[PDB]
């Protein structure tokens, strides 16, 4: 897997 | 609870006298202060067999080294030999030691961990009571301590461990190593935990126990 600064 | 305190003309190490199996006190008066050499003494915490065995082995090798070189052994030799041995076994020999002594170089105070790390300090504490002991050492330690001040500080640091740590208890053992003097080992220096008189005597009337058989054992040749 999932998108993640 | 084991501590080391450096003073003007030497080093003093102290320890409690409690040995434990789980939550049980196996020995109320065991000696945690070890003679590596006449003027190099060790305080041991952790696995009781490991601290004794590792202290005796290095002590034996130091005695042989002293005979070979015809010189009084040095604390750095005991330190180097202990740390290399402990490092080799990658912490599997659970000995946490405070190494203090006087030699031709001067007075030294070191600590060794089971994995083979060493530190240098004016005051050190090791074992379950280290935090209770260190609190006292941090509160009352000063530069240029006298021998009388150093013994008091060391014994007070052990007392903190005895009272506040469940792992530590019973009496206080002190060893004083002063430059140009014989190391003086004060076994049971303090005995502030004496068992009070029992209310009753549990001495039994003779013949109380039922006996099936009796026989004489032959221990002679």
């Amino acid at each position: 897997x999932f998108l993640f600064x | 609870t084991i501590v080391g305190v450096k003073f003007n003309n030497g080093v003093v190490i102290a320890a409690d006298t409690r040995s434990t199996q789980g939550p049980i006190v196996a020995d109320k008066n065991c000696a945690k202060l070890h003679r590596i050499s006449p003027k190099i003494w060790c305080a041991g915490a952790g696995t009781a067999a490991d601290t004794e065995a590792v202290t005796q082995l290095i002590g034996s090798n130091i005695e042989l080294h002293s005979l070979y070189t015809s010189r009084e052994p040095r604390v750095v030799s005991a330190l180097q030999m202990l740390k290399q041995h402990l490092f080799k076994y990658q912490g599997h020999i659970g000995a946490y030691l405070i190494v203090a002594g006087v030699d031709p170089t001067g007075s030294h105070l070191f600590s060794i961990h089971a994995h083979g790390s060493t530190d240098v300090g004016y005051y050190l504490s090791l074992g379950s009571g280290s935090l209770a002991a260190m609190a006292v050492l941090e509160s009352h330690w000063k530069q240029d301590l006298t021998k009388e001040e150093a013994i008091k500080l060391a014994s007070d640091a052990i007392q903190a461990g005895i009272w506040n740590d469940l792992g530590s208890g019973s009496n206080v053992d002190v060893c004083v190593m002063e430059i140009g003097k014989d190391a003086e080992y004060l076994r049971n220096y303090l005995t502030p935990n004496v068992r009070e008189e029992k209310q009753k005597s549990y001495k039994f009337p003779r013949g109380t126990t039922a006996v099936l058989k009796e026989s004489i054992v032959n221990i002679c040749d």
Partner: protein, 222 residues
């Protein structure tokens, strides 16, 4: 992962006489190798001449004693201020404990008082409410140290009559309150020497027809 249970140490001791009963406990509360308190009572007067102690996980022990004290209060309201007999109290506590059979109270419970014939009574419970009336019971950390000694000195177990070839047992008899308190004091001083979680102070609650009396005695603080 969050563990809802802990061990606060401590040890408790109940002994039943002829016309009296004692419930003793050390006053030391611990976590791991730290002392929380040197004086934290865990033996409580619950009213109706019933003394109680729930030793183990202090939070569960406080919760149970609180709930039982409340049970006594509501028994008075619902049954015209009727006195809760020690046998009735014991059955009530079984239901309190078994109520949480699948999330148990991690405590060993002892209650003491007089039965309806005025004779000394001690009941002991497991964590999930199985109970039994006994002359003699130790609970908690140092139960294994105290209990065999009580077998020998209270119930005279393994003691035979001198000269009888171990054929005639030493006869059972009721001990005085004075003789019982001696065994309690010696039981706890012994346990203090050999168990790191036992020490600091000993609080004894004595229950007679006259009511509930307290005695306090110092123990070693190492």
């Amino acid at each position: 992962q969050f563990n809802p249970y802990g061990d606060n140490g401590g040890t408790i001791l109940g002994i039943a006489g002829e016309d009296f009963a004692v419930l003793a406990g050390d006053t030391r509360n611990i976590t791991d190798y730290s002392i929380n308190s040197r004086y934290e009572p865990k033996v409580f007067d619950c009213g109706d001449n019933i003394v109680m102690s729930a030793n183990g996980f202090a939070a569960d022990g406080d919760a149970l004693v609180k709930r039982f004290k409340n049970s006594v209060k509501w028994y008075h309201f619902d049954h015209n201020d009727k006195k809760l007999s020690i046998n009735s109290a014991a059955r009530n506590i079984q239901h309190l404990l078994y109520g949480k059979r699948f999330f148990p109270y991690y405590v060993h419970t002892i209650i003491a008082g007089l039965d309806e014939d005025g004779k000394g009574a001690v009941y002991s419970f497991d964590p999930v409410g199985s109970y039994e009336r006994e002359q003699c019971r130790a609970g908690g950390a140092a139960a294994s140290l105290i209990m065999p000694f009580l077998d020998n000195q209270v119930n005279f177990k393994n003691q035979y009559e001198p000269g009888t070839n171990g054929k005639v047992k030493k006869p059972l008899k009721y001990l005085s309150v004075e003789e019982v308190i001696k065994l309690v004091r010696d039981s706890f001083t012994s346990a203090t020497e050999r168990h790191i979680q036992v020490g600091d102070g000993l609080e004894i609650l004595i229950v007679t027809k006259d009511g509930v009396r307290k005695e306090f005695y110092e123990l070693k603080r190492d």
